[PDB]
Design an enzyme around this catalytic site. Structure first.
Site, PDB file in Angstrom:
ATOM      1  N   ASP A   1     -50.671  51.651 104.203  1.00  0.00           N
ATOM      2  CA  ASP A   1     -51.392  52.324 103.123  1.00  0.00           C
ATOM      3  C   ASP A   1     -50.699  52.224 101.760  1.00  0.00           C
ATOM      4  O   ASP A   1     -49.794  53.012 101.447  1.00  0.00           O
ATOM      5  CB  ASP A   1     -51.581  53.792 103.491  1.00  0.00           C
ATOM      6  CG  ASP A   1     -52.622  54.474 102.642  1.00  0.00           C
ATOM      7  OD1 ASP A   1     -52.931  53.947 101.553  1.00  0.00           O
ATOM      8  OD2 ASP A   1     -53.120  55.542 103.068  1.00  0.00           O
ATOM      9  N   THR A   2     -51.137  51.280 100.939  1.00  0.00           N
ATOM     10  CA  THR A   2     -50.493  51.104  99.633  1.00  0.00           C
ATOM     11  C   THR A   2     -50.787  52.255  98.671  1.00  0.00           C
ATOM     12  O   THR A   2     -50.117  52.379  97.639  1.00  0.00           O
ATOM     13  CB  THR A   2     -50.914  49.790  98.952  1.00  0.00           C
ATOM     14  OG1 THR A   2     -52.338  49.789  98.739  1.00  0.00           O
ATOM     15  CG2 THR A   2     -50.498  48.570  99.806  1.00  0.00           C
ATOM     16  N   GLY A   3     -51.794  53.080  98.978  1.00  0.00           N
ATOM     17  CA  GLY A   3     -52.118  54.217  98.132  1.00  0.00           C
ATOM     18  C   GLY A   3     -51.305  55.450  98.468  1.00  0.00           C
ATOM     19  O   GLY A   3     -51.417  56.467  97.788  1.00  0.00           O
TER      20      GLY A   3
HETATM   21  C1  LIG Z   1     -60.788  62.698 107.766  1.00  0.00           C
HETATM   22  O1  LIG Z   1     -60.457  61.530 107.068  1.00  0.00           O
HETATM   23  C2  LIG Z   1     -60.421  60.370 107.870  1.00  0.00           C
HETATM   24  C3  LIG Z   1     -60.412  60.375 109.268  1.00  0.00           C
HETATM   25  C4  LIG Z   1     -60.365  59.172 109.986  1.00  0.00           C
HETATM   26  C5  LIG Z   1     -60.335  57.918 109.343  1.00  0.00           C
HETATM   27  C6  LIG Z   1     -60.344  57.879 107.933  1.00  0.00           C
HETATM   28  C7  LIG Z   1     -60.323  57.042 106.921  1.00  0.00           C
HETATM   29  C8  LIG Z   1     -60.368  57.477 105.742  1.00  0.00           C
HETATM   30  C9  LIG Z   1     -60.294  56.782 104.378  1.00  0.00           C
HETATM   31  O2  LIG Z   1     -60.209  55.582 104.160  1.00  0.00           O
HETATM   32  N1  LIG Z   1     -60.211  57.748 103.329  1.00  0.00           N
HETATM   33  C10 LIG Z   1     -60.028  57.348 101.982  1.00  0.00           C
HETATM   34  C11 LIG Z   1     -58.659  57.934 101.654  1.00  0.00           C
HETATM   35  O3  LIG Z   1     -58.475  58.969 101.041  1.00  0.00           O
HETATM   36  N2  LIG Z   1     -57.513  57.174 102.164  1.00  0.00           N
HETATM   37  C12 LIG Z   1     -56.174  57.617 101.916  1.00  0.00           C
HETATM   38  C13 LIG Z   1     -55.312  57.439 103.135  1.00  0.00           C
HETATM   39  C14 LIG Z   1     -55.975  58.151 104.341  1.00  0.00           C
HETATM   40  C15 LIG Z   1     -56.615  57.442 105.268  1.00  0.00           C
HETATM   41  C16 LIG Z   1     -57.252  58.167 106.451  1.00  0.00           C
HETATM   42  C17 LIG Z   1     -57.181  59.508 106.545  1.00  0.00           C
HETATM   43  C18 LIG Z   1     -56.466  60.291 105.495  1.00  0.00           C
HETATM   44  C19 LIG Z   1     -55.894  59.661 104.438  1.00  0.00           C
HETATM   45  C20 LIG Z   1     -55.674  56.712 100.804  1.00  0.00           C
HETATM   46  O4  LIG Z   1     -55.298  55.480 101.308  1.00  0.00           O
HETATM   47  C21 LIG Z   1     -54.476  57.409 100.184  1.00  0.00           C
HETATM   48  O5  LIG Z   1     -53.337  57.277 100.629  1.00  0.00           O
HETATM   49  N3  LIG Z   1     -54.733  58.266  98.997  1.00  0.00           N
HETATM   50  C22 LIG Z   1     -56.055  58.470  98.432  1.00  0.00           C
HETATM   51  S1  LIG Z   1     -55.889  59.758  97.218  1.00  0.00           S
HETATM   52  C23 LIG Z   1     -54.175  59.310  96.960  1.00  0.00           C
HETATM   53  C24 LIG Z   1     -54.085  58.092  96.067  1.00  0.00           C
HETATM   54  C25 LIG Z   1     -53.405  60.436  96.364  1.00  0.00           C
HETATM   55  C26 LIG Z   1     -53.668  58.971  98.366  1.00  0.00           C
HETATM   56  C27 LIG Z   1     -53.200  60.141  99.234  1.00  0.00           C
HETATM   57  O6  LIG Z   1     -53.969  60.717  99.989  1.00  0.00           O
HETATM   58  N4  LIG Z   1     -51.809  60.540  99.174  1.00  0.00           N
HETATM   59  C28 LIG Z   1     -51.370  61.651 100.010  1.00  0.00           C
HETATM   60  C29 LIG Z   1     -50.005  61.281 100.601  1.00  0.00           C
HETATM   61  C30 LIG Z   1     -49.921  60.586 101.765  1.00  0.00           C
HETATM   62  C31 LIG Z   1     -51.162  60.167 102.486  1.00  0.00           C
HETATM   63  C32 LIG Z   1     -48.538  60.234 102.351  1.00  0.00           C
HETATM   64  C33 LIG Z   1     -47.408  60.623 101.678  1.00  0.00           C
HETATM   65  C34 LIG Z   1     -47.507  61.401 100.368  1.00  0.00           C
HETATM   66  C35 LIG Z   1     -48.747  61.713  99.848  1.00  0.00           C
HETATM   67  C36 LIG Z   1     -48.876  62.486  98.547  1.00  0.00           C
HETATM   68  C37 LIG Z   1     -61.110  57.849 101.039  1.00  0.00           C
HETATM   69  C38 LIG Z   1     -60.744  57.406  99.667  1.00  0.00           C
HETATM   70  C39 LIG Z   1     -61.800  56.396  99.324  1.00  0.00           C
HETATM   71  O7  LIG Z   1     -62.365  55.945 100.630  1.00  0.00           O
HETATM   72  C40 LIG Z   1     -62.387  57.178 101.437  1.00  0.00           C
HETATM   73  O8  LIG Z   1     -60.388  58.852 105.739  1.00  0.00           O
HETATM   74  C41 LIG Z   1     -60.387  59.145 107.245  1.00  0.00           C
END
Ligand SMILES: COc1cccc2cc(C(=O)N[C@H](C(=O)N[C@@H](Cc3ccccc3)[C@H](O)C(=O)N3CSC(C)(C)[C@H]3C(=O)NCc3c(C)cccc3C)[C@H]3CCOC3)oc12
Lengths: 99, 99
Positions: free
Chosen positions: A25-27
């Site tokens: 996860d690059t985000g």
């Molecule tokens: C209930 O939720 C889900 C359940 C099962 C599968 C998926 C998949 C996705 C998904 O792809 N979700 C995306 C998403 O938010 N993905 C995020 C990762 C993720 C994937 C699956 C479940 C939950 C999260 C994103 O890649 C990220 O890191 N984001 C998006 S918003 C952000 C840029 C701030 C950052 C963040 O959350 N950062 C929090 C964070 C993490 C995760 C780790 C360490 C520190 C921090 C601050 C959104 C955004 C647009 O498309 C839909 O969600 C799911």
């Protein structure tokens, strides 16, 4: 490897003697894993994104083997819906985004 | 380009004739941008991130440029903490993860 993005980029990781699937996860700034035991001291942290914030335990200096590549760094443990490998460990295995 | 992950991977995008910063996010299925005016009709969507679910507006066939790479695809608008370019558009511009 070269990993395309037609589907979610999950890989197998080894952490704390356990095998898990986790998303490259690059985000994500950090790495967060579902509830599990890890050795050493931890401190409370609150992290947030889409949908809001959650409370986690922060463990430092943890080794994770990520698709066969070893690294060391901080690992967060908490109620994440998905195991996530974030930039703090992606850098260490030499991962880049290319287009 | 080849984008490393030591800092958040923001790039400049152009949408509706305006330049914005957006995060290249391999962990995101979809692309979501902060409130702005987009043309056409929209449909409802729920997306779920680290902290729960949120309601967004789904606009289809939106013209968007990503770091100079022209794309046309689905853009979500909603209360995202930052602009996020997800896999639907990362695939379209030919992005891969490499290590
Ligand atoms: C209930 O939720 C889900 C359940 C099962 C599968 C998926 C998949 C996705 C998904 O792809 N979700 C995306 C998403 O938010 N993905 C995020 C990762 C993720 C994937 C699956 C479940 C939950 C999260 C994103 O890649 C990220 O890191 N984001 C998006 S918003 C952000 C840029 C701030 C950052 C963040 O959350 N950062 C929090 C964070 C993490 C995760 C780790 C360490 C520190 C921090 C601050 C959104 C955004 C647009 O498309 C839909 O969600 C799911």
């Amino acid at each position: 490897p070269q990993i395309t993005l037609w589907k979610r980029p999950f890989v197998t990781i080894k952490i704390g003697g356990q095998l898990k699937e986790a998303l490259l996860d690059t985000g994500a700034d950090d790495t967060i894993i579902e509830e599990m035991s890890l050795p050493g001291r931890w401190k409370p942290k609150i992290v947030g994104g889409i949908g809001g914030f959650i409370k986690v335990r922060e463990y430092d200096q943890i080794i994770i083997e990520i698709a066969g590549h070893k690294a060391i760094g901080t690992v967060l443990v908490g109620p994440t819906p998905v195991n996530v490998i974030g930039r703090n460990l992606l850098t260490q295995i030499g991962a880049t985004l290319n287009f």
